[PDB]
Short mmCIF file of C-alpha atoms in Angstrom, two decimals:
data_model
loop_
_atom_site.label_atom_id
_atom_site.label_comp_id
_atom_site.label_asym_id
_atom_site.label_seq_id
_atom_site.Cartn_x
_atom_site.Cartn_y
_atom_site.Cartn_z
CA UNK A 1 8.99 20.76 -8.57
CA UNK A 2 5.43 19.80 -7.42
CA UNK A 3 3.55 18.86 -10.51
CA UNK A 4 1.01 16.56 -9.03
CA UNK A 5 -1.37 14.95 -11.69
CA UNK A 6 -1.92 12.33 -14.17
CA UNK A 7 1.15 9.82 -15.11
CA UNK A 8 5.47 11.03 -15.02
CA UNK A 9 6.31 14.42 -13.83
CA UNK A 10 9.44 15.66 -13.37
CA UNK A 11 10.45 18.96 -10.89
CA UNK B 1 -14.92 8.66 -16.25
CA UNK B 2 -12.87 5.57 -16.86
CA UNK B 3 -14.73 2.50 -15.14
CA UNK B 4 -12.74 -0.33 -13.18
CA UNK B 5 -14.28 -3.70 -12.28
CA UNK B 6 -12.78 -6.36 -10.19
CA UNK B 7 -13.87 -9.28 -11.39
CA UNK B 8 -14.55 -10.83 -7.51
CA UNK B 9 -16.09 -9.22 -4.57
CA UNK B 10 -15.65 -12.45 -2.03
CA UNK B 11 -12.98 -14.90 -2.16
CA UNK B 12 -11.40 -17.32 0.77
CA UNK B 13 -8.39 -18.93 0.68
CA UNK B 14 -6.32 -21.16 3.37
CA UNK B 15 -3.25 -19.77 5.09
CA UNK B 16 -0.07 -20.31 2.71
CA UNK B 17 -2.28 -19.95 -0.42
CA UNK B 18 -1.36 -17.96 -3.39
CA UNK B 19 -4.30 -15.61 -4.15
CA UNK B 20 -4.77 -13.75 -7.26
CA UNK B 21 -7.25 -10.45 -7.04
CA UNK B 22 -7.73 -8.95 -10.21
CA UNK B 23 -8.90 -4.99 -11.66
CA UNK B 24 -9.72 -4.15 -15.04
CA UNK B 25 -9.74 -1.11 -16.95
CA UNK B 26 -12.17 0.16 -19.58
CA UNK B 27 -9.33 1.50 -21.46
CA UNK B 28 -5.93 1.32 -21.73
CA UNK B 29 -4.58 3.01 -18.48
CA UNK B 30 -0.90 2.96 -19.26
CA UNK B 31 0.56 0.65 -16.06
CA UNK B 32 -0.30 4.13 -13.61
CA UNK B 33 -2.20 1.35 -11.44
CA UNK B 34 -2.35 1.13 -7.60
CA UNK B 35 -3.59 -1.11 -4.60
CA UNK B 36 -4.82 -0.41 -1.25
CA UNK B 37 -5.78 -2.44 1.70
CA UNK B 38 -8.65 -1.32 3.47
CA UNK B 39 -8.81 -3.67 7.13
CA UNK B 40 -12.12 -4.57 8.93
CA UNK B 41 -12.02 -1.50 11.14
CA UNK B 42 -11.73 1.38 8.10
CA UNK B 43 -7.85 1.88 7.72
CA UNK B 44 -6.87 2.37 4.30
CA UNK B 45 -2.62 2.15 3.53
CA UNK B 46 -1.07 2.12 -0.24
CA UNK B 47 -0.33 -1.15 -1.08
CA UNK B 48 1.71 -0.95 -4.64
CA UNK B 49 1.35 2.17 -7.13
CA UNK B 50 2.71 1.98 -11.22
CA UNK B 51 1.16 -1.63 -10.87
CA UNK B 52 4.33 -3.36 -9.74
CA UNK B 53 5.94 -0.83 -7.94
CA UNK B 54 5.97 -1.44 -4.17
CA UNK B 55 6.26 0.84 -1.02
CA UNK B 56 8.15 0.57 1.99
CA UNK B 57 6.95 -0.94 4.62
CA UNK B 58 4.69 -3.70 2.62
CA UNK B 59 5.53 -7.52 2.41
CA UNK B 60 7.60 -9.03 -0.29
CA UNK B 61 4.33 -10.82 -0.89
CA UNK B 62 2.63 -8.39 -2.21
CA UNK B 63 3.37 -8.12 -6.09
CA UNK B 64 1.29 -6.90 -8.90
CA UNK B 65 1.12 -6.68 -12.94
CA UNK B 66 -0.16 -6.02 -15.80
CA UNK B 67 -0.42 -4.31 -19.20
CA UNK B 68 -3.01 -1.93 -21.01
CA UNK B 69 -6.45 -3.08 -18.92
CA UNK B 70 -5.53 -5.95 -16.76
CA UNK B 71 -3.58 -6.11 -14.03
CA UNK B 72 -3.53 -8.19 -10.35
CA UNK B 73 -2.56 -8.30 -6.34
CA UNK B 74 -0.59 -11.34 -6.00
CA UNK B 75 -0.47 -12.40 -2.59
CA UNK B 76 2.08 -14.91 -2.49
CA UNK B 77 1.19 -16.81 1.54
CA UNK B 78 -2.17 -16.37 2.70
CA UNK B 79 -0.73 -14.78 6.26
CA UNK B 80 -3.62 -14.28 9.15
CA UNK B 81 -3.21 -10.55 8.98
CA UNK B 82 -4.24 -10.30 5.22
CA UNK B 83 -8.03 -10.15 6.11
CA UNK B 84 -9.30 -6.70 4.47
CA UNK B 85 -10.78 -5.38 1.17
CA UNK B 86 -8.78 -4.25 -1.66
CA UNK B 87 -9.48 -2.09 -4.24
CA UNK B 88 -7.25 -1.04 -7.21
CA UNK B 89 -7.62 2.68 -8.56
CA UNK B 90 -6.93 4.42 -12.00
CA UNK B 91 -4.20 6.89 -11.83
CA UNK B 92 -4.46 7.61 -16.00
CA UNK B 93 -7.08 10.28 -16.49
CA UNK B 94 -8.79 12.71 -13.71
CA UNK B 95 -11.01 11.59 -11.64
CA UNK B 96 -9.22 8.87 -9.96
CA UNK B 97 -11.69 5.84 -10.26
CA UNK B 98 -11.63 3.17 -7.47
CA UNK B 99 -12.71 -0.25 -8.36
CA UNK B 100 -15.14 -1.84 -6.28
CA UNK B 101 -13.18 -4.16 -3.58
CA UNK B 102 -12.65 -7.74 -3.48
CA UNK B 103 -13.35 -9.14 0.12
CA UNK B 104 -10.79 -11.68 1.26
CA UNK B 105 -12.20 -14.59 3.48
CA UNK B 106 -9.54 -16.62 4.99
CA UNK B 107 -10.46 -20.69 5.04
CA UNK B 108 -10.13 -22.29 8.20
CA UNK B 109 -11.76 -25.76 10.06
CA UNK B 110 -14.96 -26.09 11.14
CA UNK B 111 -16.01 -24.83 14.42
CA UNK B 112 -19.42 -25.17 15.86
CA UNK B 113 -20.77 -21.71 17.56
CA UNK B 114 -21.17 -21.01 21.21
CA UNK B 115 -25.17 -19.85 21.95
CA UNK B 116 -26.07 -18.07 24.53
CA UNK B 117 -29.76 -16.95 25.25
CA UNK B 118 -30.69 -13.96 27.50
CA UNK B 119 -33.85 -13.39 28.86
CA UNK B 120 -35.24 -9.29 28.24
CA UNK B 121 -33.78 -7.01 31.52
CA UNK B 122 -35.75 -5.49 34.08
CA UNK B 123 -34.99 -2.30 32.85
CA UNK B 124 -36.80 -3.14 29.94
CA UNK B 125 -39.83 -4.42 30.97
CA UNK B 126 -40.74 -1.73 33.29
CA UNK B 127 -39.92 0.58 30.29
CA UNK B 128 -42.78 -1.63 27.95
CA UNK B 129 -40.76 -4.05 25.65
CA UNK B 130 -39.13 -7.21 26.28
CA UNK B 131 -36.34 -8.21 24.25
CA UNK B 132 -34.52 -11.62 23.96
CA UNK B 133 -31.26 -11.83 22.81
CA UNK B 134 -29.39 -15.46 21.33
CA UNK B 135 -24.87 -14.82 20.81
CA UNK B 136 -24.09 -17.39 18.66
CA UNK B 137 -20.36 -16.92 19.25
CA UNK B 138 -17.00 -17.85 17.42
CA UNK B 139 -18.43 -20.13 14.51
CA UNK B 140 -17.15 -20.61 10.85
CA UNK B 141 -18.44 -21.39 8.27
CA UNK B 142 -20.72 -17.90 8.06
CA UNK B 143 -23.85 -19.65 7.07
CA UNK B 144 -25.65 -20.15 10.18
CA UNK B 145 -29.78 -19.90 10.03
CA UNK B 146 -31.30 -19.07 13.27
CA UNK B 147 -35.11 -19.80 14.33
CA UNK B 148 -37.00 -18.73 17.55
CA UNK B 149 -39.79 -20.59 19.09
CA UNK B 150 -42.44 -19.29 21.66
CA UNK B 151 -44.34 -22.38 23.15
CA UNK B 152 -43.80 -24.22 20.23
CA UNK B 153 -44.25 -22.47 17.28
CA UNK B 154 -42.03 -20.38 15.61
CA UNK B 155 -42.07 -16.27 15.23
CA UNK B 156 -40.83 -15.32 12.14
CA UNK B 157 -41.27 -11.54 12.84
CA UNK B 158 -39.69 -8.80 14.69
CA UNK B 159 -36.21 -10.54 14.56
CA UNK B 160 -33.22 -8.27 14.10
CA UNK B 161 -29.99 -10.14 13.01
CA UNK B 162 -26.09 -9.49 12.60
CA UNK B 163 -22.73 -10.83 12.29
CA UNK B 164 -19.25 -9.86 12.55
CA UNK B 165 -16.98 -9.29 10.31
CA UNK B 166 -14.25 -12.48 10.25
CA UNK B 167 -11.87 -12.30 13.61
CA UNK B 168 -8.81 -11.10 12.74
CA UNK B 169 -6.72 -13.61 14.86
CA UNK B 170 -8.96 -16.81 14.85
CA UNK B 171 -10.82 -16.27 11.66
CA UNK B 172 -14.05 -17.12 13.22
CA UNK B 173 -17.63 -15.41 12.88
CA UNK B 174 -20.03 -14.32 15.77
CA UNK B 175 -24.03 -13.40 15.15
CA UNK B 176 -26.18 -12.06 17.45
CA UNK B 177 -30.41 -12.25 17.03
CA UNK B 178 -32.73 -10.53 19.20
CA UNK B 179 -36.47 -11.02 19.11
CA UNK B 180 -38.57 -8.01 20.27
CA UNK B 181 -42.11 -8.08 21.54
CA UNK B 182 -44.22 -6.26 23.89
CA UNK B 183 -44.31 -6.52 27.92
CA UNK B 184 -47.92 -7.88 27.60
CA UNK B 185 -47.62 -10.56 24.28
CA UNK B 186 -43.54 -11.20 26.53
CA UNK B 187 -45.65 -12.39 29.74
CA UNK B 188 -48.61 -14.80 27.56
CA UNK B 189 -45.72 -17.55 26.49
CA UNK B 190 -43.70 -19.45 29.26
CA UNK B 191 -41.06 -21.26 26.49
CA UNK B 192 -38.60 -18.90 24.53
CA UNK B 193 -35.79 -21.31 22.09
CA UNK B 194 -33.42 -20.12 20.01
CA UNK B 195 -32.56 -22.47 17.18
CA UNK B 196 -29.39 -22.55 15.49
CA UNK B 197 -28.69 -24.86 12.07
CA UNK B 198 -25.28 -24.71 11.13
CA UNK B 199 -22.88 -26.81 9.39
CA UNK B 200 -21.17 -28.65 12.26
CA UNK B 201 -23.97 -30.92 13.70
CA UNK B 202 -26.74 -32.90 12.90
CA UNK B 203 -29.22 -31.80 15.39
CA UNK B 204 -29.72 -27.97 15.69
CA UNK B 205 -28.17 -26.40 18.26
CA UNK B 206 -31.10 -25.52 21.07
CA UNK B 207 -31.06 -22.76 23.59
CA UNK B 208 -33.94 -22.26 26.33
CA UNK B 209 -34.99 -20.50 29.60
CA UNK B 210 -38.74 -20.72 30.37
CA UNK B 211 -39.90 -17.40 32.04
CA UNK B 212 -40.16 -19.05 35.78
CA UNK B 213 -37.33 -21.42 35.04
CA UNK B 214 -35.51 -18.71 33.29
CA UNK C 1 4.33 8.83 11.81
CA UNK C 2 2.52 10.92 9.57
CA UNK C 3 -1.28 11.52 11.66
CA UNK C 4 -3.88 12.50 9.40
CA UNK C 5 -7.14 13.24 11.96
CA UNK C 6 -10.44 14.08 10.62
CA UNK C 7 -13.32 15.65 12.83
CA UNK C 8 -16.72 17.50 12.25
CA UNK C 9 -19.00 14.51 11.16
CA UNK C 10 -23.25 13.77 12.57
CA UNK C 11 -26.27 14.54 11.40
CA UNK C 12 -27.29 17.60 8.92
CA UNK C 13 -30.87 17.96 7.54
CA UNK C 14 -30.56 18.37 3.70
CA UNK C 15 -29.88 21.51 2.50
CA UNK C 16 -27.48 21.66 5.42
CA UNK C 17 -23.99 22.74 6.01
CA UNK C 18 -21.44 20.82 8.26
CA UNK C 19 -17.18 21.60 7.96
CA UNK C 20 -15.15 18.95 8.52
CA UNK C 21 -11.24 19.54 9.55
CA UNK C 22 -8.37 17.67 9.07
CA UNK C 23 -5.16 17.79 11.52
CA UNK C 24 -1.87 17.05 9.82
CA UNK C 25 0.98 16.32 12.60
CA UNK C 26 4.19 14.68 11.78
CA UNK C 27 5.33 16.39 8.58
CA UNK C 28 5.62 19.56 6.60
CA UNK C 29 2.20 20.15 5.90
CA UNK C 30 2.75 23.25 3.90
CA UNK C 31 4.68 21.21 1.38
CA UNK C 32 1.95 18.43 0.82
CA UNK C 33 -1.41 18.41 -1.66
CA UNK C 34 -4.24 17.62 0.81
CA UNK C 35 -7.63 15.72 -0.52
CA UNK C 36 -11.07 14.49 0.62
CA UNK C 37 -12.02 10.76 -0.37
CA UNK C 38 -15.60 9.37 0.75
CA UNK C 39 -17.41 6.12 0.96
CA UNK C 40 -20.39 5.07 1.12
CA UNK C 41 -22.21 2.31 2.66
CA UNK C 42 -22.14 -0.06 -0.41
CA UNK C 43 -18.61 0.49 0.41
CA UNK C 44 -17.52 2.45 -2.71
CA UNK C 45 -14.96 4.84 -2.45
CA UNK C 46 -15.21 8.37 -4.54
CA UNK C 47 -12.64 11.25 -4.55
CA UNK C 48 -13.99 14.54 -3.60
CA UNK C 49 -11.59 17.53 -3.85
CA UNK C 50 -7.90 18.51 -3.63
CA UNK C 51 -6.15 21.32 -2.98
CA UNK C 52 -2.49 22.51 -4.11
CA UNK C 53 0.16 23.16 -0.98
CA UNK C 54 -0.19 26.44 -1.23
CA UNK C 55 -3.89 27.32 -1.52
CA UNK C 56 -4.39 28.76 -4.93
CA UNK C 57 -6.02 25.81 -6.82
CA UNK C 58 -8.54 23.56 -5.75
CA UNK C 59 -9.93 21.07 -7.77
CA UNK C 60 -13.59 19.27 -7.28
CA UNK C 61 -15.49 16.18 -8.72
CA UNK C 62 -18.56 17.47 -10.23
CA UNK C 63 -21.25 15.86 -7.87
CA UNK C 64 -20.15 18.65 -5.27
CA UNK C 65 -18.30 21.07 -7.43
CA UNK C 66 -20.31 24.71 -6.64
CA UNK C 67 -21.52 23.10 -2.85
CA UNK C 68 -18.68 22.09 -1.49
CA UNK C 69 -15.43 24.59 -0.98
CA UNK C 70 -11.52 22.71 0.26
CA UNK C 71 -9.58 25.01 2.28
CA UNK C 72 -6.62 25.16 4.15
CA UNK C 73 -4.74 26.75 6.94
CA UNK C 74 -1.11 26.29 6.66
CA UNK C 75 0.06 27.51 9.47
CA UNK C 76 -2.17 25.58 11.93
CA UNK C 77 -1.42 21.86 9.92
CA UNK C 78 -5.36 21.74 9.66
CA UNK C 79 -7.07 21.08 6.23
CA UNK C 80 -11.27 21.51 5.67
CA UNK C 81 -14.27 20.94 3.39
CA UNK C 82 -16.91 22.97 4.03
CA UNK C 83 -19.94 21.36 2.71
CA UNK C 84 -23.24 22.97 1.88
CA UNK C 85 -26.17 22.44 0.48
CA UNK C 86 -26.02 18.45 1.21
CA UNK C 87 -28.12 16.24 -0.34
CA UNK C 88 -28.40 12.48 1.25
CA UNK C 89 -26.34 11.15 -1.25
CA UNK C 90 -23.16 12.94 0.56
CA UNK C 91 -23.95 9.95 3.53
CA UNK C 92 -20.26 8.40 3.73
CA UNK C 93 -17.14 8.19 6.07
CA UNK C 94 -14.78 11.16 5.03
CA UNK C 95 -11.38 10.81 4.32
CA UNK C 96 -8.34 13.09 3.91
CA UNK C 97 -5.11 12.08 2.42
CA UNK C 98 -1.57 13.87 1.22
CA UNK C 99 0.22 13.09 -2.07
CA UNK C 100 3.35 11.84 -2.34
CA UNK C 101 5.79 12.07 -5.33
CA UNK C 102 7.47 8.73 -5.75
CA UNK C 103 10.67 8.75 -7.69
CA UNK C 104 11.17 6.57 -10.85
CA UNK C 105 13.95 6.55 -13.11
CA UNK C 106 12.37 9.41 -16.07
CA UNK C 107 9.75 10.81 -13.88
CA UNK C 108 8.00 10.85 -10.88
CA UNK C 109 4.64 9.06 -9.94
CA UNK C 110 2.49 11.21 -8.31
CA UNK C 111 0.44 8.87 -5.56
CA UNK C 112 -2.64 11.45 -4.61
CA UNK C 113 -3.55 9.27 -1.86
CA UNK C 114 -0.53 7.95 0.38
CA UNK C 115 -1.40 8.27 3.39
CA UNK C 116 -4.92 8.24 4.80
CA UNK C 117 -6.73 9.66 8.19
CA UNK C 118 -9.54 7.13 10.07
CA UNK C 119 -12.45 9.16 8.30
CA UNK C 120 -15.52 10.88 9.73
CA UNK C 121 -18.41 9.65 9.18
CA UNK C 122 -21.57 12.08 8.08
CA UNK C 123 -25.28 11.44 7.77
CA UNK C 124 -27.60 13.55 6.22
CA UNK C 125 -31.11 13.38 7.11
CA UNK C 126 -34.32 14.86 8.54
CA UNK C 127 -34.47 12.45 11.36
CA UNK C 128 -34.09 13.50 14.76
CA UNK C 129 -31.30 12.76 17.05
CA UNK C 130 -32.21 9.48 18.93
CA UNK C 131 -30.07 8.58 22.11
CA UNK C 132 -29.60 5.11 22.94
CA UNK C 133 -31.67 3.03 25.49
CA UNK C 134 -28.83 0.27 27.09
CA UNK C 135 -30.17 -2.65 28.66
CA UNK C 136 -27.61 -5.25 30.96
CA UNK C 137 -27.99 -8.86 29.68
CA UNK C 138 -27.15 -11.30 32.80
CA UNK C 139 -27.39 -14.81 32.03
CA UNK C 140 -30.45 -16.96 33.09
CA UNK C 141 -31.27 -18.41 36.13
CA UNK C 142 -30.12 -21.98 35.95
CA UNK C 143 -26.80 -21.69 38.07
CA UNK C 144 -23.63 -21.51 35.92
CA UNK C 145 -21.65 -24.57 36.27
CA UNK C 146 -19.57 -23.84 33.59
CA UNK C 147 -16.38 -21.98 33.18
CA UNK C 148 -16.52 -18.98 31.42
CA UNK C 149 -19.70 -16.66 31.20
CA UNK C 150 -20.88 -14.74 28.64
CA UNK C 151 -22.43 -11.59 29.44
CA UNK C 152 -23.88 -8.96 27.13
CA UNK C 153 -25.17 -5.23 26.61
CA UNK C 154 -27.95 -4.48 24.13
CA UNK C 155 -28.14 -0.68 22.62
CA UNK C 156 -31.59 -0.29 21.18
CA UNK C 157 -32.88 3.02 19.50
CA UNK C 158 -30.67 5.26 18.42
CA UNK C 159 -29.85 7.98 15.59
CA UNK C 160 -27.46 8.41 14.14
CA UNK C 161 -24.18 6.57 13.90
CA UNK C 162 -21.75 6.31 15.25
CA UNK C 163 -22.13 4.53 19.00
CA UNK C 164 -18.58 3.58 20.71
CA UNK C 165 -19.35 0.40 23.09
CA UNK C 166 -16.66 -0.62 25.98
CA UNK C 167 -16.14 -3.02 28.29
CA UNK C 168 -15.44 -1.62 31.49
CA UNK C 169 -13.69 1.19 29.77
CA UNK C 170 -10.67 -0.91 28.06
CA UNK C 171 -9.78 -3.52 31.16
CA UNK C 172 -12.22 -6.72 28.94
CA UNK C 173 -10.95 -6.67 25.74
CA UNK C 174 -10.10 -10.56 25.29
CA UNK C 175 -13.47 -12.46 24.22
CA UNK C 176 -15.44 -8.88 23.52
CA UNK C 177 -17.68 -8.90 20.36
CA UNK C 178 -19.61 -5.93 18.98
CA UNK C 179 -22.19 -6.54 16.48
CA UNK C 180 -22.52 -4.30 13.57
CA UNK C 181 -25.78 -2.36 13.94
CA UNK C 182 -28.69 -2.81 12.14
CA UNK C 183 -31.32 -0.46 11.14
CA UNK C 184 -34.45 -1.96 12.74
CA UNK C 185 -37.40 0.46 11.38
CA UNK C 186 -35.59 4.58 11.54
CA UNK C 187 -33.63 3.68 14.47
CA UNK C 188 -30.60 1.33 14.75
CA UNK C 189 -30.01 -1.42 17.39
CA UNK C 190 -26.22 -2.90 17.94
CA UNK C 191 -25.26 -5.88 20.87
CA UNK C 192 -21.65 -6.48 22.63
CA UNK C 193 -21.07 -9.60 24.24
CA UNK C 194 -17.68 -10.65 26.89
CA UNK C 195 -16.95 -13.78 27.87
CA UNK C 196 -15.22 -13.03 31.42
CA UNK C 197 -14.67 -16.65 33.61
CA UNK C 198 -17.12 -17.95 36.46
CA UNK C 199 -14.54 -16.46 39.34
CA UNK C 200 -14.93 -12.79 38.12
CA UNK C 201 -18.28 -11.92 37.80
CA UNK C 202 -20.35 -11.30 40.12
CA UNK C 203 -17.37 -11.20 42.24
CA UNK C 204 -15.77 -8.27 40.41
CA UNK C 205 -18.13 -6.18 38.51
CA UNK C 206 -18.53 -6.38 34.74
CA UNK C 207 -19.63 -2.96 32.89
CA UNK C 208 -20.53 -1.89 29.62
CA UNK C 209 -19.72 1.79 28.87
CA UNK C 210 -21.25 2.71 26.22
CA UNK C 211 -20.87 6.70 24.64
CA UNK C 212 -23.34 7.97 21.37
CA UNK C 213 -21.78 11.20 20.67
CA UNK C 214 -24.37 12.61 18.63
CA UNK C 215 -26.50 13.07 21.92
CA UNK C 216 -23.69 13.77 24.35
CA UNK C 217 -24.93 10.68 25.68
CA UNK C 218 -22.22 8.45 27.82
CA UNK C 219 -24.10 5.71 29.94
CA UNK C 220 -22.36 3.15 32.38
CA UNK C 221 -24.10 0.08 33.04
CA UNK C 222 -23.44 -2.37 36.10
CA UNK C 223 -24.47 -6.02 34.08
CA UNK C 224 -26.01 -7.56 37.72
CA UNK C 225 -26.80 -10.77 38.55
CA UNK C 226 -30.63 -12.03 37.74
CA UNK C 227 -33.10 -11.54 40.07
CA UNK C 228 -36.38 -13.87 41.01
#
């Protein structure tokens, strides 16, 4: 999705 | 915060060289790493992000490392166009921390500057102040010392001077000095020099214009 | 390309309030997290603020969390800080950025600052608006019998920065060299110098355009020849 934050997101 | 340091502000290297910046972390910041090129006019692009991880767009060149705190910008040939600051940033925990910049200085031969003194305008001295100006143009190394002398002795004071940042295609310097004084103390000296002491010669490099032979 | 164009910076007294914008062109802004980035002029860079795609969260650094408010308006591609109650230390070139998601094999690496704008540059202080005095430099009077000739431009007393310095409005741009400013005593002073070739000036006319914003001050000057 948009996770957009510290280190591997995924969706 | 977490803090980064790069261990070198400055460092100049030849074209072709292999140059090595390097970031640390205060902590172990798990590889989420990244490098951006800021050029002499303010332009900032992303250079690599997850430490080795490249984007399109940037030179095979360009490579970077590292594990737990210490990673580097591996700039494998100097090219001309590499001039700029680069800093590395912490992508672990929030804030994002930015180191503070290494400077990259490219090395190049010696060239001696070109002066140029100008006598204060017309416009100026109806308007009160008279102000001489000395280019001392396309030069390198940086370290240039410049000295002005009014009918012999030398004025220390009232002396504003500044250089540019390295040319991006002939990696040469330029520096410009002006010397301000007053209509009246302008019009009680006939001599004005400009002294420049770089690198290149023996003798200093002289410019003059007396004030009738100006 | 992607544009990323920030406007609003010049002076504010402290305590002040000045709104910067940001306008997005050449991608789906609406999709995008926008943020503000600064720097100072011991060239540090510090993040600022972001805010999510959609508007609902906005995040701040502490040192203007509760004066500063991010904003957006989606359907004109044009992002904003408004900043209040500014304190000196807020001096620095303003940046805005977008994210961008970059794919990896288990995960994606979020990038918060991707692609960057030219910046904006704001100072805050109680000094007055100073427009620029610009003075023709024409060389001395010992006939040139050489090739090329330097001529130069001097902008003395002005407040605050920026000043944008041309020579004759684009047409010299081989041999030009603008010197950083420096700030003589409240008031900076920068220098330009050309290097055009003995057959062009005075024959053709040199001039130094020279434009401080902050003023609305725009002033052309003829360099002429020396007089006795």
């Amino acid at each position: 999705x948009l996770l957009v934050t510290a280190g591997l997101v995924l969706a | 915060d977490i803090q980064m340091t790069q261990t070198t502000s400055s460092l100049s290297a030849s074209l072709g060289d292999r140059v090595t910046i390097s970031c640390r972390a205060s902590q172990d910041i798990s590889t989420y790493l990244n490098w951006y090129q800021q050029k002499p006019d303010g332009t900032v692009k992303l250079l690599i992000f997850y430490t080795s991880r490249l984007r399109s767009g940037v030179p095979s060149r360009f490579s970077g490392s590292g594990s737990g705190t210490d990673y580097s910008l591996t700039i494998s040939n100097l090219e001309q166009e590499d001039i700029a600051t680069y800093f590395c940033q912490q992508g672990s925990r929030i804030p994002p921390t930015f180191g503070g910049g290494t400077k990259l200085e490219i090395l190049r031969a010696d060239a001696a500057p070109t002066v140029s003194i100008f006598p204060p305008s017309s416009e100026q001295l109806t308007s009160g102040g008279a102000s001489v100006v000395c280019f001392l143009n396309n030069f390198y190394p940086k370290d240039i010392n410049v000295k002005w002398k009014i009918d012999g002795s030398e004025r220390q004071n009232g002396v504003l001077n500044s250089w540019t940042d390295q040319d991006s295609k002939d990696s040469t310097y330029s520096m410009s000095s002006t010397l301000t004084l007053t209509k009246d103390e302008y019009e009680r000296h006939n001599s004005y020099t400009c002294e420049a002491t770089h690198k290149t010669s023996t003798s200093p490099i002289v410019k003059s214009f007396n004030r009738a032979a100006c | 390309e992607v544009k990323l164009v920030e406007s609003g910076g010049g002076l504010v007294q402290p305590g002040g309030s000045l709104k910067l914008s940001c306008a997005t062109s050449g991608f789906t802004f609406s999709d995008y997290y926008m943020y503000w980035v600064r720097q100072n002029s011991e060239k540090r860079l510090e993040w600022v603020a972001f805010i999510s795609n959609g508007g609902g969260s906005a995040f701040y650094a502490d040192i203007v969390k509760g004066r500063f408010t991010i904003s957006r308006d989606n359907a004109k591609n044009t992002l904003y800080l408004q900043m209040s109650r500014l304190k000196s230390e807020d001096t620095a070139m303003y940046y805005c950025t977008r994210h961008t998601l970059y794919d990896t094999l288990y995960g994606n690496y979020p990038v918060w600052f991707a692609d960057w704008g030219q910046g904006t540059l704001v100072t805050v202080s109680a000094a007055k608006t100073t427009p620029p005095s610009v003075y023709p430099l024409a060389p001395g009077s010992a006939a040139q019998t050489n090739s090329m000739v330097t001529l130069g431009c001097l902008v003395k007393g002005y407040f605050p920065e920026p000043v944008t310095v041309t020579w004759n409005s684009g047409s010299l741009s081989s041999g030009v060299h603008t010197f950083p400013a420096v700030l003589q005593s409240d008031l900076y002073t920068l220098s330009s110098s050309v290097t055009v070739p003995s057959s062009s000036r005075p024959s053709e006319t040199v001039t130094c355009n020279v434009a401080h914003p902050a003023s609305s001050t725009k002033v052309d000057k003829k360099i002429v020849p020396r007089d006795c």
